[PDB]
Write an enzyme that holds these catalytic residues in place. Structure first.
Site, mmCIF file in Angstrom:
data_model
loop_
_atom_site.group_PDB
_atom_site.id
_atom_site.type_symbol
_atom_site.label_atom_id
_atom_site.label_comp_id
_atom_site.label_asym_id
_atom_site.label_seq_id
_atom_site.Cartn_x
_atom_site.Cartn_y
_atom_site.Cartn_z
ATOM 1 C CG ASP A 422 -1.948 1.018 1.331
ATOM 2 O OD1 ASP A 422 -2.328 1.598 0.282
ATOM 3 O OD2 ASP A 422 -2.322 1.316 2.487
ATOM 4 C CD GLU A 425 -0.160 5.677 -3.891
ATOM 5 O OE1 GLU A 425 -0.911 4.758 -4.251
ATOM 6 O OE2 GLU A 425 0.219 5.822 -2.702
HETATM 7 O O1 LIG Z 1 -3.803 0.601 5.699
HETATM 8 C C1 LIG Z 1 -4.832 1.580 5.846
HETATM 9 C C2 LIG Z 1 -5.550 1.900 4.549
HETATM 10 C C3 LIG Z 1 -6.810 2.759 4.878
HETATM 11 C C4 LIG Z 1 -6.537 4.068 5.629
HETATM 12 C C5 LIG Z 1 -7.790 4.950 5.919
HETATM 13 C C6 LIG Z 1 -8.358 5.506 4.626
HETATM 14 C C7 LIG Z 1 -9.531 6.430 4.910
HETATM 15 C C8 LIG Z 1 -10.617 5.681 5.661
HETATM 16 C C9 LIG Z 1 -10.057 5.196 6.992
HETATM 17 C C10 LIG Z 1 -9.612 6.391 7.802
HETATM 18 C C11 LIG Z 1 -8.504 7.102 7.066
HETATM 19 C C12 LIG Z 1 -9.059 7.613 5.757
HETATM 20 C C13 LIG Z 1 -7.364 6.130 6.767
HETATM 21 C C14 LIG Z 1 -8.887 4.244 6.710
HETATM 22 N N1 LIG Z 1 -4.546 2.606 3.717
HETATM 23 C C15 LIG Z 1 -4.958 2.895 2.350
HETATM 24 C C16 LIG Z 1 -5.419 1.639 1.643
HETATM 25 O O2 LIG Z 1 -5.906 2.067 0.376
HETATM 26 C C17 LIG Z 1 -6.501 0.944 2.450
HETATM 27 O O3 LIG Z 1 -6.898 -0.265 1.819
HETATM 28 C C18 LIG Z 1 -5.952 0.635 3.824
HETATM 29 O O4 LIG Z 1 -6.928 -0.061 4.581
#
Ligand SMILES: OC[C@@]1(CC[C@]23C[C@H]4C[C@H](C[C@H](C4)C2)C3)NC[C@H](O)[C@@H](O)[C@@H]1O
Ligand SMILES: *[C@@H]1O[C@H](CO)[C@@H](O[C@@H]2O[C@H](CO)[C@@H](O[C@@H]3O[C@H](CO)[C@@H](O)[C@H](O[C@H]4O[C@H](CO)[C@@H](O)[C@H](O)[C@@H]4O)[C@@H]3O)[C@H](O)[C@H]2NC(C)=O)[C@H](O)[C@H]1NC(C)=O
Ligand SMILES: *[C@@H]1O[C@H](CO)[C@@H](O[C@@H]2O[C@H](CO)[C@@H](O[C@@H]3O[C@H](CO)[C@@H](O)[C@H](O)[C@@H]3O)[C@H](O)[C@H]2NC(C)=O)[C@H](O)[C@H]1NC(C)=O
Ligand SMILES: *[C@@H]1O[C@H](CO[C@@H]2O[C@@H](C)[C@@H](O)[C@@H](O)[C@@H]2O)[C@@H](O[C@@H]2O[C@H](CO)[C@@H](O)[C@H](O)[C@H]2NC(C)=O)[C@H](O)[C@H]1NC(C)=O
Ligand SMILES: *[C@@H]1O[C@H](CO[C@@H]2O[C@@H](C)[C@@H](O)[C@@H](O)[C@@H]2O)[C@@H](O[C@@H]2O[C@H](CO)[C@@H](O)[C@H](O)[C@H]2NC(C)=O)[C@H](O)[C@H]1NC(C)=O
Ligand SMILES: *[C@@H]1O[C@H](CO)[C@@H](O[C@@H]2O[C@H](CO)[C@@H](O)[C@H](O)[C@H]2NC(C)=O)[C@H](O)[C@H]1NC(C)=O
Ligand SMILES: [Cl-]
Ligand SMILES: [Cl-]
Ligand SMILES: [Cl-]
Ligand SMILES: [Cl-]
Length: 853
Positions: A422, A425
Site C-alpha cells: 500500500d 505512490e
Molecule cells: O492501511 C490503511 C488503509 C486505509 C486508511 C484509511 C483511509 C480512509 C478511511 C479510513 C480512515 C482514514 C481515511 C485512513 C482508513 N490505507 C490505504 C489503503 O488504500 C486501504 O486499503 C488501507 O486499509
C-alpha cells in the site's frame, strides 16, 4: 491563416491563461469559442522542427530534426535525432532524443504498417498497409522538445480510444477536450483526477473493427489531451519520446503485442484466485481467528485471511505488537494447518524516529544507504503511519538486497504467504518532506500537468530528491512498480514458490510482477458500476489480477449493495472484501439469512469455475491474453459492443450481466450474435444452503439488447455456444476444492460442436512451463461425442477425476448414453431446458469417448 476548424485547434497556451496580445506575440491565433476548445491555437504555419538528412539503415530510418525558431518554453532542444525501427511485422518503434546529451530513459511477407515523413513541419505518418488508413500523423501539431516539456500530437482514426490508466472513467475515453493526467497520486477514486497508477498506452478502434495501440515509454508527469477532430497530444515534463505502434489488427492482438514489450502477466498461485477477507479493525489474533471461525460456521469459502495495520507494533513494517498479536506466528501456522493462506499490509515508508539500534529496518537501511536522499545527502523524511519516515529507493541494488533481507527475516518469525503493498505512490501525509522542498526547476517546472493539488509535491515527496538511477521527478511514476519488482524477488527468495503481490500504485509492465486493487472506493452503487470499466481497463494493460474492495471500502455498505457487489465481485479476477477502519462490518456472515444465501451462491459459483479461471490466467501468462475482457475485444466487428462496459466476459465464453442499481429485479444487457446458455441450467453443488429456484434456458441473439430477470439472489451468467468449461467440486478452501472430482459444461453450437481446455499444475511451484510440470487437455464435442485430447500429461493432473458431463443444447432426449462404449450408470434429460446430465468415472489424463443418440 487562422481559418482552422474549431475541433482541430491545438492549444498554444497550455502553460497559462493568456490575453489576445500575448497569444498573437507567440505567433498564435486568438478566436474565442462561441460557448474546453482553446481560444489560443497554432496556425498551420507555426514553427516546428524540419526533417533533414533522412537516411536508410538495416533496422529502419535515421534523421536530424532542426528547430530554427524557439517556442515560448525555456530550454528548447534545437537539434534532435530521429530513429525509426521496423522491429516486427506488427511493431513499429521510433525515438526522438537529444544527440548532444544523454537524457533520462525509463529502465505477402510485409509489415502491417507503412511509414512516411512530412519534411516541414516534421511529422511521422503511419498507415495500415491493408486499407490505407492513417493511424498516426504527428504533422497535425508542432513538435515541442524542451528540457521539461515534450509535446507530440496525432490524429486518431475514430472517436473510440481506451487506456491511459489510472482514472475513474468509462472504458471508452471522451474526446471532448479531455485532459488525462498521469501522476501517481494517493486519492480516493473520483472522476477527472490523477489516481494511483500511470499507463501511457492507448488502444484505438478503426471503422470495421481493426485496432492499433500506441505506447509512450515515458515515466514523467504528463497530460494526454483528447479533442473531437479527433486527435490526441502527449505532453510530458521530461525524458524523451520513445513510441511503439502495435498494428493488431484484432484488439486482442494489439494487447498481446503491447505485452510482448512490457511483459506477459505473472502466473498467480491457485490459492490467490480464492476468496480474500480483510479490514482495518481485526485488532487481535483472537478477532482475526473469529473471522475464519464465522466464515467456516456459515459455509463461506475463504482461502486467505488478511490483516491491515492492526498486526504491527506502532504501525511499523517488519514488527508485530505484543498485545493483540503476541501469538501472531502461531495464528499464521494454524491458518496453514487448516489449508488457508495469510496476507498482511506492508507500507514503503520506514520509521526514522526510534532510538538508534532499536529498529533494524531503519538502522540497516541507514547503514546500507537504501533511502531516498535530499539536497544535503541525508534521508528525505516524511510523515506516514508510524510518524517520521524515510522512503526506500527501489532503483538502488543495495535497497533490493535490504528489502529481501527484511522480508526473509520477518518471514522466519511469521510465515506470511504474500505481500499487500500500500501507499507506494509514494504517499506522504505532508507536502514534500518535514523540511519542505527547495526552490528549483524540478519542484517548480515550467509546465505543471493537471494534478490534484496543482503541484507535483502534493501528497508525496520532493521532485528533486535523489534516487540511484535519477531524480524522483523522472522516477515517481515507477516507485510502486520498483517496489512490486523488489517484493516479487523478496518472496521468491523467502518462500521458494510463486509470489503473490497486490500493489496500489502501478506503471506499464506492473502485471509481469504483481496484481492491483482499485483503492479507496466508496460503498455506493456508482462505484460498483464504475468498478467494471476499471477491471476491464487493467486487463487491457496486462494487469489481469485486479479487483475492487467487494461491498466497497469507504462508508457503510447496505445489505442490497453488498449482495450485488458480491455477485459481480465473484467475477473480479482478484476477489477481496476489504473494509475501512470507520465502517460497519460487511463480512458475508454479518448479513441476514436471505442475503447470506445469495452471497454463498456467488462464492460457490466462483470456486466451481476456479479450474477455468486458472486456465484463463495460464493463457494470459503464456500468450498475453486478457482474463476479464470487454465485449468489443471478443466481437470487434459488432460496433454495438464498442461502448459496452457494464458487462464483462471471462475469456471468450462466459458473459456476466450484473445488476448495478438499487431496487432492480431485471437487467438489460447486450448479446452478441449467437446462442447464449443460461449457466443456471448447469448443476452446481454447494456445502451450505443456496437460494430457492426462481427464465429462458438459451438466448438466440442476432446481436441485440435483451432484458433478463435479475432478482436479488441472481446474477446473470451465460455460456457461449461452442465452448466447454471445466468445473471442480466445492470446498471452503482451494486445498479442499482441488481434491474434488471435476465436471464438464459443454455448450453445443446448432451444428453440435464445442471446444475447451484445462491447464493444471501443482498450483504454486516456480518454473512449471520450463520444467514441463503440468497437464494440458483439450475437450472436443462433435457428432454427439465428447473426447479429451492429451497435449501433455504428468504426475500433476494425471489422477484428476471427471464424474459429471452437462451438455447444453441437446435437441431430443437420447435413447442411450455411452462412456467408452458402455451404457452409463445414470443420466437425466430435461425436455424444457434441453440439458443432458451424465454421471461418469473418467480421468482427465486418460483418453475417453462419451457418446449419445
Ligand atoms: O492501511 C490503511 C488503509 C486505509 C486508511 C484509511 C483511509 C480512509 C478511511 C479510513 C480512515 C482514514 C481515511 C485512513 C482508513 N490505507 C490505504 C489503503 O488504500 C486501504 O486499503 C488501507 O486499509
Ligand atoms: C535533509 O534531510 C535531513 C533529515 O534527514 C534534514 O535534517 C533536519 O534539519 C532541520 C533543520 O534544518 C532540523 O531541525 C532542527 O531540529 C532540532 C531538534 O531536533 C532543533 O534544535 C532545531 O531548531 C533550530 O532551528 C530552528 C529553525 O526552525 C529554530 O526555531 C530553533 O530556535 C533552533 O535554532 C531545528 O528545528 C531537523 O532536526 C533535521 N532532521 C533530522 C531528522 O535530523 C535536512 O534539513 C534536509 N535538508 C534539506 C535541505 O531539506
Ligand atoms: C497529416 O496531417 C497533416 C496536417 O493535418 C495533413 O497535411 C495537410 O493536408 C491538408 C489537406 O491535404 C492541406 O491542405 C491542402 O493544401 C493544399 C496544398 O497546399 C491545398 O491546395 C488544398 O486546398 C488544401 O488546403 C494542408 O496544407 C496540410 N498541412 C500541412 C502542414 O502540410 C496531411 O494530409 C496528413 N497526412 C495524411 C496522409 O493524412
Ligand atoms: C546533413 O548532412 C550534411 C553532410 O554531412 C556529411 O554526410 C553525412 C551523411 C554524414 O556522413 C556526415 O558525418 C558528413 O559530415 C551536413 O553538411 C555538412 O556539414 C559539415 C559540418 O558543418 C561540413 O563539414 C560539410 O561541409 C557539409 N557538407 C555538405 C555537402 O553540405 C549537414 O550539416 C547535415 N545537416 C544537419 C542539420 O545535421
Ligand atoms: C457508518 O455507520 C457508523 C455507525 O452508525 C451507527 O450504528 C449503526 C448500527 C447504524 O444503525 C447507524 O444508523 C448508526 O448511526 C457511523 O458512525 C457514527 O458517527 C457519528 C459521529 O459522526 C456518531 O454520532 C455515531 O454514534 C457513530 N456511531 C458509531 C457506533 O460510531 C458512521 O458515520 C457511518 N459512516 C458514514 C460515512 O455514513
Ligand atoms: C463472530 O460471530 C460471533 C457469534 O455471532 C460474534 O459474537 C457475538 O457478537 C455479538 C454482537 O454482534 C455479541 O452481542 C455477542 O455477545 C457475541 N456472541 C458470541 C457467541 O460471542 C462475533 O462478533 C463475530 N466475530 C467477528 C470477528 O466477526
Ligand atoms: Cl483579452
Ligand atoms: Cl538522468
Ligand atoms: Cl445499439
Ligand atoms: Cl515442454
Amino acid at each position: 491563416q487562422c481559418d482552422v476548424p474549431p475541433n482541430s485547434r491545438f492549444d498554444c497556451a497550455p502553460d497559462k491563461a493568456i490575453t489576445q496580445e500575448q497569444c498573437e506575440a507567440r505567433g498564435c491565433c486568438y478566436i474565442p469559442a462561441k460557448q474546453g476548445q482553446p481560444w489560443c491555437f497554432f496556425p498551420p504555419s507555426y514553427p516546428s522542427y524540419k526533417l533533414e538528412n533522412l537516411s536508410s539503415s538495416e533496422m529502419g530510418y535515421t534523421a536530424t530534426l532542426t528547430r530554427t525558431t524557439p517556442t515560448f518554453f525555456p530550454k528548447d532542444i534545437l537539434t534532435l535525432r530521429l530513429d525509426v525501427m521496423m522491429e516486427t511485422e506488427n511493431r513499429l518503434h521510433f525515438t526522438i532524443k537529444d544527440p548532444a546529451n544523454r537524457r533520462y530513459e525509463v529502465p505477402a511477407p510485409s509489415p502491417l504498417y507503412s511509414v512516411e515523413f512530412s519534411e516541414e513541419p516534421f511529422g511521422v505518418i503511419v498507415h495500415r498497409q491493408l486499407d490505407g488508413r492513417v493511424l498516426l500523423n504527428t504533422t497535425v501539431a508542432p513538435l515541442f522538445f524542451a528540457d521539461q516539456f515534450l509535446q507530440l500530437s496525432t490524429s486518431l482514426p475514430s472517436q473510440y480510444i481506451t487506456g491511459l490508466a489510472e482514472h475513474l472513467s468509462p472504458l471508452m475515453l471522451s474526446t471532448s477536450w479531455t485532459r488525462i493526467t498521469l501522476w501517481n497520486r494517493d486519492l480516493a477514486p473520483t472522476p477527472g483526477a490523477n489516481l494511483y497508477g500511470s499507463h501511457p498506452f492507448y488502444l484505438a478502434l478503426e471503422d470495421g473493427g481493426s485496432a492499433h495501440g500506441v505506447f509512450l515509454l515515458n515515466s514523467n508527469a504528463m497530460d494526454v489531451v483528447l479533442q473531437p477532430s479527433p486527435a490526441l497530444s502527449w505532453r510530458s515534463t521530461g525524458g524523451i519520446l520513445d513510441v511503439y505502434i502495435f498494428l493488431g489488427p484484432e484488439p486482442k492482438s494489439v494487447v498481446q503485442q503491447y505485452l510482448d514489450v512490457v511483459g506477459y502477466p505473472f502466473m498467480p498461485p491457485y490459492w490467490g484466485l480464492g476468496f480474500h477477507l480483510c479490514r482495518w479493525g481485526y485488532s487481535s489474533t483472537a478477532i482475526t481467528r473469529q473471522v475464519v471461525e464465522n466464515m467456516t460456521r456459515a459455509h463461506f469459502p475463504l482461502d486467505v485471511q488478511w490483516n491491515d495495520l492492526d498486526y504491527m507494533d506502532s504501525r511499523r513494517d517488519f514488527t508485530f505488537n505484543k498485545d493483540g498479536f503476541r501469538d501472531f506466528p502461531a495464528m499464521v501456522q494454524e491458518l496453514h494447518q487448516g489449508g488457508r493462506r495469510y496476507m498482511m499490509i506492508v507500507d514503503p515508508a520506514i520509521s526514522s524516529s526510534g532510538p538508534a539500534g532499536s529498529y533494524r529496518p531503519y538502522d540497516e537501511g541507514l547503514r546500507r544507504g537504501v533511502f531516498i536522499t535530499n539536497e544535503t545527502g541525508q534521508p528525505l523524511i516524511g510523515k506516514v503511519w508510524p510518524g517520521s519516515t524515510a522512503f526506500p529507493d527501489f532503483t538502488n541494488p543495495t535497497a533490493l538486497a535490504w528489502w529481501e533481507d527484511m522480508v526473509a527475516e520477518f518471514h522466519d518469525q511469521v510465515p506470511f504467504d504474500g505481500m499487500w503493498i500500500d501507499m507506494n505512490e509514494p504517499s506522504n501525509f505532508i507536502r514534500g518532506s518535514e523540511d519542505g522542498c527547495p526552490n528549483n526547476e524540478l519542484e517548480n517546472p515550467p509546465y505543471v500537468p493537471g494534478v490534484v493539488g496543482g503541484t507535483l509535491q502534493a501528497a508525496t515527496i520532493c521532485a528533486s530528491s535523489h534516487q540511484f538511477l535519477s531524480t524522483h521527478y523522472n522516477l515517481h511514476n515507477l516507485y510502486g512498480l520498483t517496489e512490486a519488482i523488489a517484493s516479487h524477488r523478496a518472496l521468491v527468495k523467502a518462500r521458494g514458490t510463486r509470489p503473490f503481490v497486490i500493489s496500489r500504485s502501478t506503471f506499464a509492465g506492473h502485471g509481469r510482477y504483481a496484481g492491483h486493487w482499485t483503492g479507496d472506493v466508496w460503498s455506493s452503487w456508482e462505484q460498483l458500476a464504475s468498478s467494471v470499466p476499471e477491471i476491464l481497463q487493467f486487463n487491457l494493460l496486462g494487469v489481469p489480477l485486479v479487483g475492487a474492495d467487494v461491498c466497497g471500502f469507504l462508508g457503510n455498505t447496505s445489505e442490497e449493495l453488498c449482495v450485488r457487489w458480491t455477485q459481480l465481485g465473484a467475477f473480479y479476477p482478484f476477489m477481496r472484501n476489504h473494509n475501512s477502519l470507520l465502517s460497519l462490518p460487511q463480512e458475508p456472515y454479518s448479513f441476514s439469512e436471505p442475503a447470506q444465501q445469495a452471497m454463498r451462491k456467488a462464492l460457490t459459483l466462483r470456486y466451481a469455475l476456479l479450474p477455468h479461471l486458472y486456465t484463463l490466467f495460464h493463457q494470459a501468462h503464456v500468450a498475453g491474453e486478457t482474463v476479464a475482457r470487454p465485449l468489443f475485444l471478443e466481437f470487434p466487428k459488432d460496433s454495438s459492443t464498442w461502448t459496452v462496459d457494464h458487462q464483462l466476459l471471462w475469456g471468450e465464453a462466459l458473459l456476466i450481466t450484473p445488476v448495478l442499481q438499487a431496487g432492480k429485479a431485471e437487467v438489460t444487457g447486450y448479446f452478441p450474435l449467437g446462442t447464449w446458455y443460461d449457466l443456471q441450467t448447469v448443476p452446481i453443488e454447494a456445502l451450505g444452503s443456496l437460494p430457492p429456484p426462481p427464465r429462458e434456458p438459451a438466448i438466440h441473439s442476432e446481436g441485440q439488447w435483451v432484458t433478463l430477470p435479475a432478482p436479488l439472489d441472481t446474477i446473470n451468467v451465460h455460456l457461449r455456444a461452442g465452448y466447454i468449461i471445466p468445473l471442480q467440486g466445492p470446498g471452503l478452501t482451494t486445498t479442499e476444492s482441488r481434491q474434488q472430482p471435476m465436471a464438464l459444461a459443454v455448450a453445443l453450437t446448432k451444428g453440435g460442436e464445442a471446444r475447451g481446455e484445462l491447464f493444471w499444475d501443482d498450483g504454486e511451484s516456480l518454473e512449471v512451463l520450463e520444467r514441463g510440470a503440468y497437464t494440458q487437455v483439450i475437450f472436443l464435442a462433435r457428432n454427439n461425442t465428447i473426447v479429451n485430447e492429451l497435449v501433455r500429461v504428468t504426475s500433476e493432473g494425471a489422477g484428476l477425476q471427471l464424474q459429471k458431463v452437462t451438455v447444453l443444447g441437446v435437441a431430443t432426449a437420447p435413447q442411450q448414453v455411452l462412456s467408452n462404449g458402455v451404457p452409463v450408470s445414470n443420466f437425466t434429460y430435461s425436455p424444457d431446458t434441453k440439458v443432458l446430465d451424465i454421471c461418469v468415472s473418467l480421468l482427465m489424463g486418460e483418453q475417453f469417448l462419451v457418446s449419445w443418440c
